[PDB]
Design an enzyme around this catalytic site. Structure first.
Site, PDB file in Angstrom:
ATOM      1  N   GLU A  61       0.288   9.415  12.441  1.00  0.00           N
ATOM      2  CA  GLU A  61       0.641   8.151  13.070  1.00  0.00           C
ATOM      3  C   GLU A  61       2.139   7.923  13.007  1.00  0.00           C
ATOM      4  O   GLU A  61       2.777   8.221  12.003  1.00  0.00           O
ATOM      5  CB  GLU A  61      -0.001   6.952  12.342  1.00  0.00           C
ATOM      6  CG  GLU A  61      -1.518   6.876  12.324  1.00  0.00           C
ATOM      7  CD  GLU A  61      -2.036   5.546  11.770  1.00  0.00           C
ATOM      8  OE1 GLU A  61      -1.241   4.586  11.644  1.00  0.00           O
ATOM      9  OE2 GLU A  61      -3.243   5.461  11.471  1.00  0.00           O
ATOM     10  N   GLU A  96      -4.836   6.184   5.519  1.00  0.00           N
ATOM     11  CA  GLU A  96      -3.857   5.552   4.666  1.00  0.00           C
ATOM     12  C   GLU A  96      -4.170   5.111   3.239  1.00  0.00           C
ATOM     13  O   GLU A  96      -4.185   3.913   2.928  1.00  0.00           O
ATOM     14  CB  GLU A  96      -3.240   4.396   5.440  1.00  0.00           C
ATOM     15  CG  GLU A  96      -2.645   4.854   6.755  1.00  0.00           C
ATOM     16  CD  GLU A  96      -1.827   3.778   7.405  1.00  0.00           C
ATOM     17  OE1 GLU A  96      -1.069   4.073   8.356  1.00  0.00           O
ATOM     18  OE2 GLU A  96      -1.948   2.623   6.965  1.00  0.00           O
TER      19      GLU A  96
END
Ligand SMILES: OC[C@H]1O[C@@H](O[C@H]2[C@H](O)[C@@H](O)[C@H](O)O[C@@H]2CO)[C@H](O)[C@@H](O)[C@@H]1O
Length: 377
Positions: free
Chosen positions: A309, A168
């Site tokens: 995710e 991320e």
């Protein structure tokens, strides 16, 4: 070329596995789950205080999954890190092992079970996701050396499909500050200090030198460059690691047969995005948003896109809109052939998402799982 006899490659938007010994080459799908813990102060996948590690892998497989994304932090991959939170009564074969030896053991067994593993460099430290691939303390050269060491070691395990370079990439300030203030990741600024796209080619090239048989998973950033982000009405509302709007004009320069774009996407249990308001058309407004943020990379450009995710509480102690959100996302993934994915998470101990397993770490949430298994056919 491969140290395991197994070679992974991307053809079109499909991942293929090649066995150089039998000569077999078939496409593969990743029906995965994230099993986290090695990136936390525990320095070991969570839940071993309640379950046997082997039993966990067997249960994951019994539900139809064939892949695990395994997050880790720098400390967990260095010799000698002591893991905390293991019931050795239930995990005798783990007694006296350091975190690295436990990861090896888990990955080796996952392989016997036919479970693919994706290594994810989730955090530099072990407490939170940093916006960039380096800190005041830890340099990019250190990041890469960590990856090189990890690749030289785990490249020897056949079922490890590759590396999710950095979890991320994102920003900690607002735009336009974010695009230049240097505190967050960008894409297409032509600025090596913060261009994740430029960084991915660097990190990725180093890894392929040592593990040529691997795939390289590249996530999106949060903000890219003001031109790109401003060219779309929801260009400032992409998830961390979820903005791939800049791929069109700024492809990542890694061999096409090794690169995999890996966006993250979440629902209302994680953040109350403005587009989740019913008066905004929720959830029927989602397909176009997903399409803009990352879908087009596959649907338009033809690249392999593996959602790294996605998850949420699915109405169990959380925002009831999340059930609709997950139902819609799975609908959309199936319709548009986004067959490869990693759900967040196998673990029930995720603050804003919960997981496939319930709080007892034994039983699963049936309705949540029944929705997701539509992707597994
Ligand atoms: O991406 C997961 C991360 O999201 C964080 O919320 C962000 C969101 O990602 C971004 O799209 C929005 O515009 O801003 C919010 C606030 O930073 C969330 O706070 C984290 O808990 C979550 O892990």
């Amino acid at each position: 070329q491969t140290p395991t006899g197994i070679y992974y490659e991307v053809r079109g938007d499909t991942i293929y596995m090649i066995n150089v010994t039998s000569g077999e080459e078939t496409p593969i799908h990743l029906f995965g789950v994230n099993w986290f813990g090695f990136e936390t102060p525990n320095h070991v996948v969570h839940g071993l205080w309640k379950r046997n590690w082997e039993d966990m892998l067997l249960q994951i497989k019994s539900l139809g999954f064939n892949a695990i994304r395994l997050p880790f932090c720098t400390e967990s991959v260095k010799p000698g890190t002591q893991p905390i939170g293991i019931d050795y009564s239930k995990n005798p074969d783990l007694r006296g092992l350091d975190s690295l030896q436990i990861m090896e053991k888990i990955i080796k067994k996952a392989g016997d079970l036919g479970i693919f593993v994706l290594l994810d460099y989730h955090r530099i430290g072990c407490t939170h996701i940093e916006p960039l691939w380096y800190t005041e303390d830890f340099s990019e050269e250190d990041f890469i050396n960590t990856w090189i060491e990890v690749a030289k070691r785990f490249g020897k395990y056949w079922n490890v499909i590759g590396a999710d370079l950095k979890n991320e990439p994102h920003s900690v300030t607002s735009p336009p500050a974010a695009y230049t203030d240097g505190t967050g990741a960008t894409w297409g600024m032509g600025n090596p200090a913060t261009d994740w796209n430029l960084a991915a080619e660097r990190i990725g090239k180093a890894i392929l030198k040592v593990a040529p048989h691997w795939l390289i998973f590249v996530e999106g950033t949060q903000f890219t460059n003001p031109k790109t982000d401003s060219s779309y009405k929801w260009g400032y509302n992409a998830w961390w690691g979820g903005n791939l709007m800049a791929v069109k004009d700024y492809p990542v320069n890694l061999p096409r047969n090794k690169l995999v774009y890996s966006p993250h996407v979440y629902g209302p249990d994680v953040y109350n995005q403005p587009y989740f308001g019913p008066a905004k058309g929720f959830p029927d407004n989602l397909p176009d948003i997903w399409y803009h943020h990352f879908g087009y990379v596959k649907l338009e450009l033809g690249y392999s896109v593996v959602i790294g995710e996605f998850g949420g509480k699915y109405g169990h102690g959380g925002d009831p809109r999340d059930v609709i959100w997950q139902n819609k996302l799975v609908d959309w993934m199936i319709e548009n052939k986004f067959c490869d994915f990693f759900y967040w998470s196998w673990n029930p101990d995720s603050g804003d998402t919960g997981g496939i397993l319930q709080d007892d770490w034994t039983t699963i949430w049936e309705d949540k799982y029944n929705n997701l298994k539509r992707l597994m056919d």
